[PDB]
Write a protein that binds this ligand. Structure first.
Ligand SMILES: Nc1nc2c(ncn2[C@@H]2O[C@H](COP(=O)(O)OP(=O)(O)OP(=O)(O)O)[C@@H](O)[C@H]2O)c(=O)[nH]1
Ligand SMILES: Nc1nc2c(ncn2[C@@H]2O[C@H](COP(=O)(O)OP(=O)(O)O)[C@@H](O)[C@H]2O)c(=O)[nH]1
Ligand SMILES: Cc1ccc(CN2CCS(=O)(=O)CC2)cc1
Ligand SMILES: [Mg+2]
Ligand SMILES: [Mg+2]
Lengths: 440, 69, 421
């Protein structure tokens, strides 16, 4: 009951999936071979962790996940890696030729050859669920598969599962680790296409994660591995309410009620703390007040933007570890005093709090220190539209000359889809302005 | 009140079914429009390459009519 | 894997083609007998991009050798790595081309093209997932120039959605005295603008100047010029044949480099000919370009850079940002983040660090203006046209080729003067 199916699309989605499931296995005591000695439920059960893992009669705990990519090299590492025995081979789906950073090839030319196989594999996971709650789709904005194939998959999932909730973890492009000049094109196209088919999307700005690794972990030139392990902690915080239970645990869907005031306004801003090296953790114990204060420091945001320049429509605090309400209440009282958190006039201003007592976990060989308590804040601020603005400006610079547009048209797309998608983004920027205007 | 309760749940069902239906139709239209466009672009390319071969033949032919044998 | 099928046509094509396979074979630990004796598993990671694996763990280049005369290919078969090539992939005629584009494209070249396609078709048919073809040839002769573009057209008819990539050697009076080279070159550019996805402009004018002024070679030979070509070809293919994130296949490189389908003619560079700042400054210097063009006379649409060897990636990132910031005037504003940088830990032979430069700059119009200048100097007086009309051609085909290349130049100028606002 309450099962969640995870779908990792393209290189970014797959590698982030490697990090997330490794971290999940460590948090739950699941070995690389899938065995979980602490689970006396052999072959099944209704435990909270069963929302993300099915069980076999042999004692195997298998992620409720599908990995898909249009070329094999990334998923091949999963097939031969440390957790190769964790997944059934049919959960790892690959083609032979990728989308070449071209949304059109992922959504049409190449994606159409494998979409039916992917949907068939997802259907096999669904059939094992007693009460499927929805999907979690991990993907980059900038890749041809992460953008084009994700969009096609999201559209097809709406057809096959109707109103079933679909959440995204979306990798917003940054120049320091970007691979294609046309990534602004692919970002606008997939955002336009999937906007109707997701009711919540967490954007992860690669530049934000890049800066946090450099600044807070003293990593000169962070790699995808550095970035993905930090991303997995944020993903873990967000899904911890689904995978663990407890007296103070608040289900992610209850935060969702507060986070999404209108279908299109469904892009929460995530902030995680503490991100601290082992050298510094050896000296400092970070209290509830300290990590909460960090949530309102823009440097710790998952997306670069200035919430001071916007208005809040919701604010949720997801704690894990050694945290009691008393400490939270005091920390929150201070923050409201020191920081001016401006809400829109049409929604309440009270922070929504959840606490998962299971303490944070870190993977060996990582750079994150192991702390006793951590927090992920999810806020709905109009300032996240600034991320759309930066992307829309690069789109406009290139599109005014039709630069690279022939690669998309050559694959079957029309200019009308570019302008239609860009107009949707302009409407979205306008929608975020309107929701922040006071009532009169 | 019972008939209003029926109409609400019927409307909820109709809204789910209509979301499925509209999504199915939009995707089918994009899939079809894209197949036509790409195939048409390949046809133009090959058609140009065919005109090249046609031209290469009327060039080899032109060399024949330059004979005084 | 993701196979590339390699083709080399004519004297120049086979000369630089052989050197290319010598250099990369050494990089991948393949010896003249096709056996692997390298040391790093990164050598064999993506070996299948350029090599087939025969019986006994033997690696055979996926290469096809074409020429309308046997001479050049015979010396290849007797070269150092001559026995590494598949004997059945030597496809040659006897009559030769006589530096005549018409002969290589319409007459003798057309009588031999089908047997070449049979071998091409045989290599492609045994590819797990063919991604495209690369052709090496000159534009000044007759075989590689005329028959080379013919093969491109015929191949493109049977593989319309695969990537077509060529290394094209532009003619220069400083190297060859053959008088008709401006004709053959323009007729070739006429084809390359239409039927290729990406072309590396290997300019014999720049190769000579590098050898003479930089290397201090009073009397540059073809061997000297070809050392630069193979070093360059090694650089621009490192991303295709080593585990890499950026521009790892022919199509992704094309999508990052070609904002408009006709402007697909690249200005390659190399350095050195030593710190990361020095490597970066040298690879962007006009004197390190393999095309006789100064990038400061135009603007960059896109740029691909690959650094080879062990070095600080933080430093590379800073120097790549620095060279862009301090030279922003030379990068079009309406293509943001148009410079991409790849890194490969495996350096080239002899060097500890190396940087290879691939520029799509509007300054390449200087190369085409030079060819057009030499072309019209002969065409406005209808000089030497009988070599070509005697094969069936008429003055119309020359006129069309002239206007197409002249149009290319104006298109480069159009985007050079374009502005964001
Ligand atoms: N955070 C993070 N970003 C990644 C990772 N891998 C790729 N990216 C980003 O994703 C974008 C490129 O898209 P990819 O996911 O690599 O491409 P793809 O989805 O496989 O699509 P194609 O390769 O074109 O078929 C760039 O912005 C990369 O910086 C990763 O492991 N972690
Ligand atoms: N860089 C370089 N250029 C060459 C080589 N051989 C010939 N060329 C050039 O190619 C042109 C002659 O074309 P050629 O290859 O002989 O024509 P083909 O053999 O009939 O196809 C002249 O401009 C030469 O300068 C070579 O080995 N290296
Ligand atoms: C009854 C009903 C309610 C909502 C929706 C639309 N919604 C889009 C976002 S989603 O794909 O995550 C879940 C469905 C359809 C039907
Ligand atoms: Mg990929
Ligand atoms: Mg010659």
């Amino acid at each position: 009951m309450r099962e969640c199916i995870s779908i990792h699309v393209g290189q970014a989605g797959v590698q982030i999936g490697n990090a997330c499931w490794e971290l999940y296995c460590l948090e739950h005591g699941i070995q690389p071979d899938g065995q979980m000695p602490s689970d006396k439920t052999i072959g099944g059960g209704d435990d909270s962790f069963n929302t993300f893992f099915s069980e076999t009669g042999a004692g195997k705990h298998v992620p409720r996940a599908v990995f898909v990519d249009l070329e094999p090299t990334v998923i091949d590492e999963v097939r031969t890696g440390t957790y190769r025995q964790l997944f059934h081979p049919e959960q790892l789906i690959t083609g032979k030729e990728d989308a070449a950073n071209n949304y059109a090839r992922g959504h049409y030319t190449i994606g159409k050859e494998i979409i039916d196989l992917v949907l068939d594999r997802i259907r096999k996971l669904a059939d094992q669920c007693t009460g499927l709650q929805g999907f979690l789709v991990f993907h980059s904005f900038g890749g041809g598969t992460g953008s084009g194939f994700t969009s096609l998959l999201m559209e097809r999932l709406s057809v096959d599962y109707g109103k079933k909730s679909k959440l995204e973890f979306s990798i917003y492009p940054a120049p320091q680790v970007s691979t294609a000049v046309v990534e602004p094109y692919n970002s606008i196209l997939t955002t336009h296409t999937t906007l109707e088919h997701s009711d919540c999307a967490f954007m992860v700005d690669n530049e934000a994660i890049y800066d946090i690794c450099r600044r807070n972990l003293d990593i000169e030139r962070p790699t995808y591995t550095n970035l993905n392990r930090l991303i997995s902690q944020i993903v873990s915080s967000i899904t911890a309410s689904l995978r663990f239970d407890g007296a103070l645990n608040v289900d992610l869907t209850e935060f969702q009620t507060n986070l999404v005031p209108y279908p299109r306004i469904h892009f929460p801003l995530a902030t995680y703390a503490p991100v601290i090296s082992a050298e510094k953790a050896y000296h400092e114990q970070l209290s509830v007040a300290e990590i909460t204060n960090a949530c309102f420091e823009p440097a710790n945001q998952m997306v670069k933007c200035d919430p001071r320049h916007g208005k809040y429509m919701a604010c949720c605090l997801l704690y894990r570890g050694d945290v009691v309400p008393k400490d939270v209440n005091a920390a929150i009282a201070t923050i409201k005093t020191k920081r001016s958190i401006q809400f829109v006039d049409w929604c309440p201003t009270g922070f929504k709090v959840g606490i998962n007592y299971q303490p944070p976990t870190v993977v060996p060989g990582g750079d994150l220190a192991k702390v006793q308590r951590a927090v992920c804040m999810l806020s709905n601020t109009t300032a996240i539209a600034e991320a759309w603005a930066r992307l829309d400006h690069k789109f406009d610079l290139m599109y005014a000359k039709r630069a690279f547009v022939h690669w998309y048209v050559g694959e079957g797309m029309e200019e009308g889809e570019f302008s239609e998608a860009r107009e949707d983004m302009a409407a979205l920027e306008k929608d975020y302005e309107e929701v922040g205007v006071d009532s009169v | 009140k019972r008939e209003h309760e029926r109409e609400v749940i019927q409307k909820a069902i109709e809204e789910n079914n209509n979301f499925i239906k509209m999504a199915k139709e939009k995707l089918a239209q994009k899939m079809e429009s894209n197949k036509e466009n790409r195939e048409a672009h390949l046809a133009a390319m090959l058609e140009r390459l065919q005109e090249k071969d046609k031209h290469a033949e009327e060039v080899r032919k032109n060399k024949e009519l330059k004979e005084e044998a | 894997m993701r196979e590339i099928v390699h083709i080399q046509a004519g004297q120049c094509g086979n000369q630089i083609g052989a050197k290319f396979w010598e250099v990369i074979s050494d990089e991948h630990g393949i010896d003249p007998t096709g056996s692997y004796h390298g040391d790093s598993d990164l050598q064999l990671e993506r070996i299948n991009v350029y090599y087939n694996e025969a019986t006994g763990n033997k690696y055979v280049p996926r290469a096809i050798l074409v020429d309308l005369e046997p001479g050049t290919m015979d010396s290849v078969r007797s070269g150092p790595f001559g026995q590494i090539f598949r004997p059945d992939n030597f496809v040659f005629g006897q009559s030769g081309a006589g530096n005549n584009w018409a002969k290589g494209h319409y007459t003798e070249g057309a009588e031999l093209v089908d047997s070449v396609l049979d071998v091409v078709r045989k290599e492609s048919e045994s590819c797990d997932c063919l991604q495209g073809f690369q052709l090496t040839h000159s534009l000044g002769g007759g075989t590689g120039s005329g028959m080379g573009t013919l093969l491109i057209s015929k191949i493109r008819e049977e593989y319309p959605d695969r990537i077509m990539n060529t290394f094209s050697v532009m003619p220069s009076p400083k190297v060859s005295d053959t008088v008709v080279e401006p004709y053959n070159a323009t007729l070739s550019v006429h084809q390359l603008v239409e039927n290729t996805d990406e072309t590396y402009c290997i300019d014999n004018e720049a190769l000579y100047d590098i050898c003479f002024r930089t290397l201090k070679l009073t009397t540059p030979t073809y061997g000297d010029l070809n050392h630069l070509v193979s070093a360059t070809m090694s650089g621009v293919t490192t991303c295709l044949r080593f585990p890499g994130q950026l521009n790892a296949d022919l199509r992704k490189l094309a999508v990052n480099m070609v904002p408009f389908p006709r402007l697909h003619f690249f200005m390659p560079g190399f350095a050195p000919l030593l710190t990361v700042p020095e490597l970066t400054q040298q690879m962007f210097d006009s004197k390190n370009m393999m095309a006789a063009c100064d990038p400061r006379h135009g603007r960059y649409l896109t740029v691909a850079a690959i650094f080879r060897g062990r070095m600080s990636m933080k430093e590379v990132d800073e120097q790549m940002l620095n060279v862009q910031n301090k030279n922003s005037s030379y990068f079009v504003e309406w293509i943001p983040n148009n410079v991409k940088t790849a890194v490969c830990d495996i350096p080239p032979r002899g060097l500890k660090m190396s940087a290879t430069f691939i520029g799509n700059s509007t300054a390449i119009q200087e190369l085409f203006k030079r060819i057009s200048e030499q072309f019209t100097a002969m065409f406005r007086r209808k000089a030497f046209l009988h070599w070509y009309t005697g094969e069936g051609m008429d003055e119309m085909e020359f006129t069309e080729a002239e206007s197409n290349m002249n149009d290319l130049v104006s298109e480069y100028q159009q985007y050079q003067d374009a502005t964001a606002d």
